[PDB]
Every structure is written in structure tokens, then in C-alpha cells.
Coordinates of N, CA, C and O and ligand atoms in Angstrom, one line a residue:
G1226 N -16.5 14.1 39.4 CA -16.2 15.5 39.4 C -16.5 16.3 38.2 O -15.7 16.3 37.2
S1227 N -17.7 16.9 38.1 CA -18.1 17.7 37.0 C -16.9 18.4 36.3 O -16.8 18.3 35.1
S1228 N -16.1 19.0 37.1 CA -14.9 19.7 36.6 C -15.3 20.7 35.5 O -14.6 20.9 34.5
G1229 N -16.3 21.5 35.8 CA -16.8 22.5 34.9 C -17.6 22.0 33.8 O -17.2 22.1 32.6
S1230 N -18.8 21.4 34.1 CA -19.6 20.8 33.1 C -20.7 21.8 32.7 O -20.9 22.0 31.5
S1231 N -21.3 22.4 33.6 CA -22.4 23.4 33.3 C -22.6 24.3 34.5 O -22.7 23.9 35.6
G1232 N -22.6 25.6 34.2 CA -22.8 26.6 35.2 C -21.9 27.9 35.0 O -21.6 28.2 33.9
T1233 N -21.5 28.5 36.1 CA -20.7 29.7 36.0 C -19.4 29.5 36.7 O -19.3 29.8 37.9
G1234 N -18.4 29.1 36.0 CA -17.0 28.9 36.6 C -15.9 29.1 35.6 O -15.3 28.2 35.1
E1235 N -15.7 30.4 35.3 CA -14.6 30.7 34.4 C -14.1 32.1 34.7 O -14.8 33.0 35.2
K1236 N -12.8 32.4 34.3 CA -12.1 33.7 34.6 C -11.1 33.9 33.5 O -10.4 33.0 33.0
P1237 N -11.0 35.2 33.1 CA -10.0 35.6 32.1 C -8.6 35.6 32.6 O -7.6 35.9 31.9
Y1238 N -8.4 35.1 33.9 CA -7.1 35.0 34.5 C -7.0 33.8 35.4 O -8.0 33.3 35.9
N1239 N -5.8 33.2 35.5 CA -5.6 32.1 36.4 C -4.1 31.9 36.7 O -3.2 32.2 35.9
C1240 N -3.9 31.4 37.9 CA -2.5 31.2 38.4 C -2.0 29.8 38.0 O -2.5 28.8 38.6
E1241 N -1.0 29.7 37.1 CA -0.5 28.4 36.7 C 0.5 27.9 37.7 O 1.3 27.0 37.4
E1242 N 0.6 28.5 38.9 CA 1.5 28.1 39.9 C 0.8 27.4 41.1 O 1.4 26.4 41.6
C1243 N -0.3 27.8 41.4 CA -1.1 27.2 42.5 C -2.4 26.6 42.0 O -2.8 25.5 42.3
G1244 N -3.1 27.5 41.2 CA -4.4 27.1 40.7 C -5.5 28.0 41.1 O -6.7 27.5 41.3
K1245 N -5.3 29.3 41.2 CA -6.3 30.2 41.7 C -6.7 31.1 40.5 O -5.9 31.7 39.8
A1246 N -8.0 31.1 40.2 CA -8.6 31.9 39.1 C -8.8 33.3 39.5 O -9.1 33.6 40.7
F1247 N -8.7 34.3 38.6 CA -8.9 35.7 38.9 C -9.8 36.3 37.8 O -9.6 36.0 36.6
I1248 N -10.7 37.2 38.2 CA -11.6 37.9 37.3 C -10.9 38.9 36.5 O -11.2 39.2 35.4
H1249 N -9.9 39.6 37.2 CA -9.1 40.6 36.5 C -7.6 40.4 36.7 O -7.2 39.5 37.4
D1250 N -6.8 41.2 36.0 CA -5.4 41.1 36.1 C -4.8 41.6 37.5 O -4.3 40.8 38.3
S1251 N -5.0 42.9 37.7 CA -4.5 43.5 39.0 C -4.7 42.5 40.1 O -3.9 42.4 41.0
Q1252 N -5.9 41.8 40.1 CA -6.2 40.8 41.2 C -5.2 39.7 41.2 O -4.5 39.4 42.2
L1253 N -5.0 39.0 40.1 CA -4.0 37.9 40.0 C -2.6 38.4 40.3 O -1.9 37.8 41.1
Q1254 N -2.2 39.5 39.6 CA -0.9 40.0 39.8 C -0.6 40.3 41.3 O 0.5 39.9 41.8
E1255 N -1.6 40.9 42.0 CA -1.4 41.2 43.4 C -1.3 39.9 44.2 O -1.0 39.9 45.4
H1256 N -1.5 38.7 43.5 CA -1.4 37.4 44.2 C -0.1 36.7 43.8 O 0.7 36.2 44.6
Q1257 N 0.2 36.7 42.5 CA 1.4 36.1 41.9 C 2.7 36.6 42.7 O 3.7 35.9 42.7
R1258 N 2.5 37.7 43.3 CA 3.7 38.3 44.1 C 4.1 37.4 45.2 O 5.2 37.3 45.6
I1259 N 3.1 36.7 45.8 CA 3.4 35.7 46.9 C 4.3 34.6 46.5 O 5.1 34.1 47.3
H1260 N 4.3 34.3 45.2 CA 5.1 33.2 44.6 C 6.5 33.8 44.4 O 7.5 33.2 44.8
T1261 N 6.6 34.9 43.7 CA 7.9 35.5 43.4 C 8.8 35.6 44.6 O 10.0 35.4 44.5
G1262 N 8.2 36.0 45.7 CA 8.9 36.1 47.0 C 9.2 34.7 47.6 O 9.4 33.7 46.9
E1263 N 9.3 34.7 48.9 CA 9.6 33.5 49.6 C 8.3 32.9 50.2 O 7.8 33.3 51.2
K1264 N 7.7 31.9 49.5 CA 6.5 31.2 49.9 C 6.6 30.8 51.3 O 7.6 30.5 51.9
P1265 N 5.4 30.9 52.0 CA 5.3 30.6 53.4 C 5.4 29.1 53.7 O 5.9 28.4 52.9
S1266 N 5.0 28.7 54.9 CA 5.1 27.3 55.3 C 3.7 26.6 55.3 O 3.0 26.6 56.3
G1267 N 3.4 26.1 54.1 CA 2.1 25.4 54.0 C 1.7 25.1 52.6 O 1.5 24.0 52.2
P1268 N 1.6 26.2 51.8 CA 1.3 26.1 50.4 C 2.4 25.4 49.5 O 2.3 25.3 48.3
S1269 N 3.4 25.0 50.2 CA 4.6 24.4 49.5 C 4.2 22.9 49.2 O 5.0 22.0 49.6
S1270 N 3.1 22.7 48.5 CA 2.7 21.4 48.0 C 2.7 21.3 46.5 O 3.3 20.4 45.9
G1271 N 1.9 22.2 45.9 CA 1.8 22.2 44.4 C 0.9 23.2 43.9 O -0.1 23.5 44.6
Ligands
ZN333 ZN1 -0.8 31.3 42.8

């Protein structure tokens, strides 16, 4: 698993709750909201 060896795979933002990268803040924030609330039935893994 290269795990980011060479290429284009980086973002100034990232979710330390699920593992989703974001190019901008507004984007990430608009997502982190899903965690603050009551997570659905599925992503309840890690
Ligand atoms: Zn997340």
C-alpha cells in the first residue's frame, strides 16, 4: 500500500473522526456536522 508515496494526494483539511480529507474548511465543517449529531446506522465502525 503506497499510502501516499508519489502523486497528488493531500489536503489542507481532514476529518480525524472518520478519515475524510477536504480541500477547504467549509467543506469539512459541512461534514463534521454529521458526527456532532446522531450518526446513522452504518458508519458506526471507526
Ligand atoms: Zn468525518
